[PDB]
Tab-separated table of C-alpha atoms in Angstrom:
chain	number	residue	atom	x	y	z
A	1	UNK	CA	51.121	-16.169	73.389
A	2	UNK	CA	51.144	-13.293	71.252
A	3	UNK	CA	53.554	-14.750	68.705
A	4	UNK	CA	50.970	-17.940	68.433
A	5	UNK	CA	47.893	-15.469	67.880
A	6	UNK	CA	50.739	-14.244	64.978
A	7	UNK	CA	50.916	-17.742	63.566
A	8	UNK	CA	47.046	-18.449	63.994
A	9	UNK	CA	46.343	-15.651	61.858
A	10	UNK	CA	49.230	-16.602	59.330
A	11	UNK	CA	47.642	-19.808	58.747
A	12	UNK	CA	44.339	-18.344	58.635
A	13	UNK	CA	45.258	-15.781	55.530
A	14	UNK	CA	47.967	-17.970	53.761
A	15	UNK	CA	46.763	-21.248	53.604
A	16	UNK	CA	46.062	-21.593	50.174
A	17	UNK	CA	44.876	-24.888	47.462
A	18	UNK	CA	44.839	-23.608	44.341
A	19	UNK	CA	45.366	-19.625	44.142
A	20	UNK	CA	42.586	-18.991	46.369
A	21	UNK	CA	41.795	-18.599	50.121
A	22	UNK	CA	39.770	-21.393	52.331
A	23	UNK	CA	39.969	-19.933	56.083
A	24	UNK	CA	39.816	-16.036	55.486
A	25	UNK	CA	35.963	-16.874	55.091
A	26	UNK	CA	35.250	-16.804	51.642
A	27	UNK	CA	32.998	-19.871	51.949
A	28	UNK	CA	30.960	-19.494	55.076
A	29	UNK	CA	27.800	-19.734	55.292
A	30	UNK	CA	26.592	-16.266	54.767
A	31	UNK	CA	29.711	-15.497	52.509
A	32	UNK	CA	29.198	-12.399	50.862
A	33	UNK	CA	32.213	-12.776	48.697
A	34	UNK	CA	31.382	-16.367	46.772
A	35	UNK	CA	30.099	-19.720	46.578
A	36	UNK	CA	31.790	-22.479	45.380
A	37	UNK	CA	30.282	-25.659	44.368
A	38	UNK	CA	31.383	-29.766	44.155
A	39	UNK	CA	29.770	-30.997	40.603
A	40	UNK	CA	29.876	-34.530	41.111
A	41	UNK	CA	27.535	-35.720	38.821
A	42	UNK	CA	27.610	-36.113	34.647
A	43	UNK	CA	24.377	-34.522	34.460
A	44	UNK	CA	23.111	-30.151	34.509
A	45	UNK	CA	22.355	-29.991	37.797
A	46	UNK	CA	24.124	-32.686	39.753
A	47	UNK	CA	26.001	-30.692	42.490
A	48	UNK	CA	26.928	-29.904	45.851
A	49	UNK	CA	27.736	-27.405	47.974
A	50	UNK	CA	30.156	-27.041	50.829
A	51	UNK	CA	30.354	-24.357	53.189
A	52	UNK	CA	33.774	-23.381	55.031
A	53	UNK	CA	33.183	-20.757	57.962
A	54	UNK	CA	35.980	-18.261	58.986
A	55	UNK	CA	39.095	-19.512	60.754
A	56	UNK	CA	40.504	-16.239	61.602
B	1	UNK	CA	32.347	-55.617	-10.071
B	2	UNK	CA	34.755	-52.627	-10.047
B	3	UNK	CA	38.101	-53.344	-9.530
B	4	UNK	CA	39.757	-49.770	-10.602
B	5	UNK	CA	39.154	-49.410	-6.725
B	6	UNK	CA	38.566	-51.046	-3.503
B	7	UNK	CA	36.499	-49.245	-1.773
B	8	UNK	CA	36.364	-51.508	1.624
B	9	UNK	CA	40.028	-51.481	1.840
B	10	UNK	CA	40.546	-47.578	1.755
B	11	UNK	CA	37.634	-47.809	4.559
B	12	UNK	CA	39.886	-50.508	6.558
B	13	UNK	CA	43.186	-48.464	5.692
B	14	UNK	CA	41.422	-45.167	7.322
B	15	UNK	CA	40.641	-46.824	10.243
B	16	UNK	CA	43.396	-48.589	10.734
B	17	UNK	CA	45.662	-45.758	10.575
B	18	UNK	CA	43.175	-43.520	12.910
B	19	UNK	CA	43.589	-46.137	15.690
B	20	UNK	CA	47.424	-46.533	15.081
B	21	UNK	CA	47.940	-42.989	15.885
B	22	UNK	CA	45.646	-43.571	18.995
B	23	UNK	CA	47.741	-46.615	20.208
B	24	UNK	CA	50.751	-44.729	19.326
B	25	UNK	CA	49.534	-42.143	21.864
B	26	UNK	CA	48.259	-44.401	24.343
B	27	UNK	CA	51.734	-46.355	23.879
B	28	UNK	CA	53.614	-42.629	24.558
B	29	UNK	CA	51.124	-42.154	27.751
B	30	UNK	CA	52.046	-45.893	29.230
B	31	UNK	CA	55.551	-44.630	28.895
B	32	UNK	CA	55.766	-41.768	29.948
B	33	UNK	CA	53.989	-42.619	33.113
B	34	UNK	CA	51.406	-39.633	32.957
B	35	UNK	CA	48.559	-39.054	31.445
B	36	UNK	CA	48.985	-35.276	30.286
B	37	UNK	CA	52.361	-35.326	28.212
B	38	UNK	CA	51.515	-33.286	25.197
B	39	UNK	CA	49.689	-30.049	25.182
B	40	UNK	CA	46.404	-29.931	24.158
B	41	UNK	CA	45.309	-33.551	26.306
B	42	UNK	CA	43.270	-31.393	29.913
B	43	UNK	CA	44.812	-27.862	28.828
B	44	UNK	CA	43.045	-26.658	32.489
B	45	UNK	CA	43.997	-29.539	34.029
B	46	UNK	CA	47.907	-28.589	32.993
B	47	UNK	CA	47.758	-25.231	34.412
B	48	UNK	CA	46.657	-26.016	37.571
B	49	UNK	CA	49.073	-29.230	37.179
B	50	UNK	CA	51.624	-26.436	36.598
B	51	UNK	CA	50.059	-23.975	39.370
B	52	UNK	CA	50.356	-27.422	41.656
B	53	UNK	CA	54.032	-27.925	40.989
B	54	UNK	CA	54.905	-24.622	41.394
B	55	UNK	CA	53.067	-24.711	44.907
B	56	UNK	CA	54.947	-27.801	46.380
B	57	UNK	CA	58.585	-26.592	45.276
């Protein structure tokens, strides 16, 4: 048990896309840290946002 | 008329040769199989192609 708590948490604060962190929580919903956005359109404004809570 | 020079062929010369060096490159890209080959072409795009291959070896 404890060694897959060990690997939980391994994958939580190593799993990694492109130099930065998705499950430690830096995109929840009240992330304090940043926000990152999906600009999907050709135009200023045309974005999204997705949120991705703590996994920890 | 004036015949010392031809004006509409040094206009059909110019862009002829600025679209042979784009089908040159487009010819290179078909090739190559990839469409960043040279640097300069989606500089971001070939770091984090870069960062990306350095990620999955």
């Amino acid at each position: 048990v404890s060694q897959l708590i060990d690997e939980v948490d391994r994958i939580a604060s190593q799993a990694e896309f492109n130099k930065m962190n998705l499950l430690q929580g830096d995109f929840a919903r009240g992330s304090r840290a940043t926000s990152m956005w999906f600009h999907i359109g050709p135009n200023m404004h045309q974005r999204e946002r997705v949120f991705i809570a703590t996994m920890t | 008329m004036i015949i010392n020079h031809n004006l509409a062929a040094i206009n059909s010369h110019r862009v002829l040769k600025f679209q042979n060096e784009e089908v040159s490159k487009n010819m290179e890209k078909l090739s190559s199989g990839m469409r960043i080959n040279r640097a300069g072409d989606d500089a971001s795009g070939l770091a984090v192609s870069e960062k990306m291959r350095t990620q999955v070896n």
